[PDB]
Specification:
The protein has 229 residues and is an alpha+beta fold. The protein contains 5 helices and 10 strands, in the order βααββαββααβββββ. The longest helix is centred in the middle third of the chain and has 23 residues. The chain is globular. The chain starts with a strand and ends in a 7-residue tail after the last strand. The chain binds one DNA strand of 40 nucleotides through strand 4 and strand 5. It is classed as gene regulation. The entry lists the keywords CRISPR, crRNA, DNA binding, type IV CRISPR-Cas, CRISPRi, nuclease deficient, gene regulation.
Length: 229
DNA sequence: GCGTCTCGAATCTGATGCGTAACTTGGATGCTTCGTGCGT
């Protein structure tokens, strides 16, 4: 029930995707086993795994953050930080990279009270045939709480955490919209919504995630530091 | 109707004398007859 969060203070605030590319280039030199383990690539290939990715990325005020879900992903992050830190030190000799490790406890429990949660960035579209289902909010809303519940169940199963069988998550409203871009060469921008708020009948602990393509660092939110309503 | 980091470490971890003295130290008894009085 442990999710290991590691913060790298590059000195300059870093993009998620740019950080992913930079570390992938840096990892490419070092032992390939750790490389393929880190970016969830099958040994010998470069394919994204069907199963819930456990090691992912994320932004920070002065760098990028490592989020290793589950016991296995936490262990991978724990024995991978020294090598990536050494690589970062080698790559930037003009700045001092500093690392602090925060090992969190992950748990989720149900309460009769309705708990309101906010997510900064949301992605709800992958393919145009799926966007045909997203053509209007009438079909969009069901897809929304469906995605939230599916993501919660997926991460609970991946970390082996029992989840309240009587959950009812309800999307509340929207504030802003953005665009999600998978690769620099890709012209397609996926759907993106900012200031998303939803109601859930459970007290969420640790850090949870929702959206698509966990391996970049979008759609993340810390339930612990967000308090509640 | 919030949490991580922290969540010790290194000694020391006995030493010395005193660590018996004096007496007591066994005793006694395991025969039957003969003569002279003394109680039934």
């Amino acid at each position: 029930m442990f999710v290991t969060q590691v913060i790298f203070n590059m000195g300059e605030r870093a993009y998620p995707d740019r950080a992913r590319a930079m570390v992938a280039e840096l990892m490419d030199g070092v032992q390939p086993g750790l490389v393929a383990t880190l970016m969830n690539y099958i040994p010998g290939t470069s394919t994204s795994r069907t199963e819930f990715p456990t090691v992912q990325f994320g932004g920070a005020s002065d760098g990028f953050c490592l989020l290793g879900f589950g016991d296995g992903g936490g262990a991978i992050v724990r024995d991978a930080v020294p090598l990536i830190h050494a690589a970062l030190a080698r790559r930037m000799p003009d700045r001092i990279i500093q690392v602090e490790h925060k090992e969190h406890s992950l748990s989720a429990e149900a309460r009769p009270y309705v708990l309101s949660y906010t997510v900064p960035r949301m992605v709800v579209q992958k393919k145009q045939r799926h966007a045909e289902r997203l053509l209007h909010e009438a079909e969009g809303k069901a897809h929304l709480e469906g995605l939230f519940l599916r993501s919660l169940q997926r991460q609970a199963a991946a970390v082996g955490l029992p989840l309240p069988e009587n959950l009812e998550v309800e999307f509340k409203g929207a504030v802003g919209n953005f665009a999600a871009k998978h690769n620099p060469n890709s012209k397609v921008a996926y759907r993106g919504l900012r200031g998303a708020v939803f109601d859930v009948n459970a007290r969420l602990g640790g850090i949870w995630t929702a959206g698509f393509m966990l391996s970049k660092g979008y759609g993340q939110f810390n339930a612990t530091h967000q308090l509640s309503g």
